[PDB]
Structures are given as structure tokens and as C-alpha cells.
């Protein structure tokens, strides 16, 4: 990325924020063809401004562009819940030639604390059945969108085996993540019980399930 | 109007692949295409530009050498062909309309991978406020995605459908879960439908108490 954004931006509702741009007197400075695009996750980006300073129709008022010496800067005037996204820039150098930005992640804070809710799943009998197990542990509806998880044979730690998703956004703005624990069935068949431990904001909660 | 890109690659290091944009709803002939491709978790990388009426085209110092963009007029469609595949060619690859990027296709995934794709193995979730929750565990296929239906699609409502782990076996997992009735377990059929494309494999299992 021949283009230098800020690896992440945050404010509150309401409030403005600038993404900056930044490049030398060779590009930037020399050449006016600056797109911006909103990446939403797991989406195409969209083109939210061009030329600088100009809004494709439909593209809220709050966002507008500008360029000042080797830096082009898009502005969020008045930031809204649903304008998290990764934000680009792009620039058109001539010869047939176009640089993007590094990206920039956008974080509106505001939302209320939502502690996660867990449900926990046993081996089946069917993988059992086929020499292995695997224990389910779901988490969903928490903001913020960052947990911890540990589990627990009995009440001692579990050291090998686990794997744990990144948050991801839901539909409903809260965040979702999953974490799965690998045992024999051996394993899972000889302690009293298996515990999966979600820690959110300091508060740690639980399941436990048993053979 | 519309720019629609051909389905997912997976593709061994040293092979080549060559995706296609189908344009519509507007004058194909009248806007060049650019190809910009996504690394997972990474930035946006421009690979270069293709004319649909000089017979132009231009590459990132990147990747030239290495691909060839071309348009077929009879069909609306761009193509582009990258060869010398390697692994951190693994990415989602877009099609762009003109010289402001105005318009996206919805991307089309490669992989390169010296490993083949794999189909999951599914099983059930057993169900153990009046609810209970079900679901399937979709264990251990390469690469991504899966979807998950329920009833072949005649239940809906309050099904979640979790985003995938990437284990230490290089392969993925996912959970689909649907809360239902208590009253209903044991009168009610309850059947995950999961499909993946890549190994052009679906699996029906039904989850019982």
C-alpha cells in the first residue's frame, strides 16, 4: 500500500472523525483523482466518494472529502452505529496506474454492555461412535465484541485441544463467537464433568456439561 | 447495474485459473474494468486495468508478467487470468467498473493450497423458559463456506448459524443452532441441511432427542 491510513479510527455518536490518507508530493500531491470506499465485513466495498470531495447519489450528507498538501482526509460529520466498516482510499497516478490505502477500521462506541449468553454441547454419540469428541461451546448477543475462554476437565485447566473464534458482528450489532474442545472419548468418558468459562468485561460466566 | 463474477477457485501452487465479470443493466463498452484482489484480513491491492474499447490494458508491477486480462464482447464478460499460482495469491479477487471504481462484483474466492478441498462430516446437536436448543456440528472441511439449512428451508425462525473456526488441522468448523419448543422434540422432524459448494458435497442429518 503505497497510501498510509490509520490502522483504526473510534468516536461516539454524533461526534466527527477524519481518516487520513497520506502519501508524498509525487502522488497525492500531484494528482486530484482520490476515491474513498466503505467496506462492510464480508461485503464488496462500496465507492462513497470520488474526486476528492464528491458524493456518489445516495451516499449520506455526514460524508465528505477533502486534500490539503500530500494528505487526502474523508470526514464523518455526526457518526452513526452503522457506519463501522473498513474505509479505503484509492489514487489514480496516470499512466494507467491505481494505488489504494492500507485501510482503516472504523469503531463507533455507545452501545449499552451485554453480557454473552452460552450454551453448551456434549460429544455426540455419534462421534464418539467414531473415536472422537468435540465439545461445543456458543456464544452470542455480548457487546463488546471481545471474550476470553478457558476451559476446565473437572476443575482443572485444559491445555491442549481448544480452538476459539474472533468476535464477529451479528445482525443485531451484538457480537457472536465459538469455541470448540478436542478430546479422546477416553478423555471425555473418564472425568465428572467438562467446563467451558467465557470471560467478558472482567465477569466471568459458564456451562458444564457431563457424560 | 451489474457485475457478476464467476464461482470460488482452488487451485495447487504452480497451477493457473482464470476468473471471469459478467457485466449488465449498462453499455459494457463504454467503461474499463479494474481487478482488485483482498488477502484474508488484509488490504485492498489493485491488479491492474483492462479496456473494453482500445484494446488497452495495464498491470501492478506485482503481478505482471504473470496475468492477462481480456474481454469478450459477444458475452459482456472480462477475464483474468493469473498463472504461476502461489500461496499468498490466496484471496477474494473483484471486478470494478471504471476509472472511479463506482460499481463492485461481489468477488470471487482462490485458494492456493497444496492441500484438495474436503467435504465436512456432520452430527447432531442433541437438545438436552419452555425451549430448547439443537443443533448440527460441521466438522473438518477445506476451504470455506458452508451454508446450513433447516427442513430444507420450511424452518426459519430462530436459527443461528455461527461463523467458522479455523483449527490447527487447517481445516474448518461451524455450529448451526435453532431454538424450538420443548412440547415439540419427538413430534417435530428436526433435519440440517448443509451444503459445500467447494466439494460439491450437502448433508442432510436429522437431530433427535
Redo the contacts between chains.
Sequence with gaps: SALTQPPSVSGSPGQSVTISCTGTSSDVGSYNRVSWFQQPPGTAPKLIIYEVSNRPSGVPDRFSGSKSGNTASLTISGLQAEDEADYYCSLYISSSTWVFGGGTKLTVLGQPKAAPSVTLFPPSSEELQANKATLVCLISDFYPGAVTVAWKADSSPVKAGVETTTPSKQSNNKYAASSYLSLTPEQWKSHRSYSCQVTHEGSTVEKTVAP | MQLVQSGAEVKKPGASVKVSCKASGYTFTNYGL?W?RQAPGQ????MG?VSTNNG???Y?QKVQGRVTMTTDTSTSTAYMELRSLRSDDTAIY?C?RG?????????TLLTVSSASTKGP?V????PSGGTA?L?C?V?DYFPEPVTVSWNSGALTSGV?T???????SGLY???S?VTVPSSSLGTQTYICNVNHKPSNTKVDKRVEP
Design positions: 479494474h482488485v488490504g485492498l491491492e489493485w486495468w488497452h490494458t495495464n501492478a473483484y470494478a476509472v472511479d471504481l463506482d460499481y463492485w462484483g461481489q468477488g462430516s452430527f447432531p446437536l442433541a436448543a443443533g456440528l466438522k443461528h455461527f461463523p467458522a473456526v479455523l483449527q490447527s468448523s461451524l455450529s443452532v
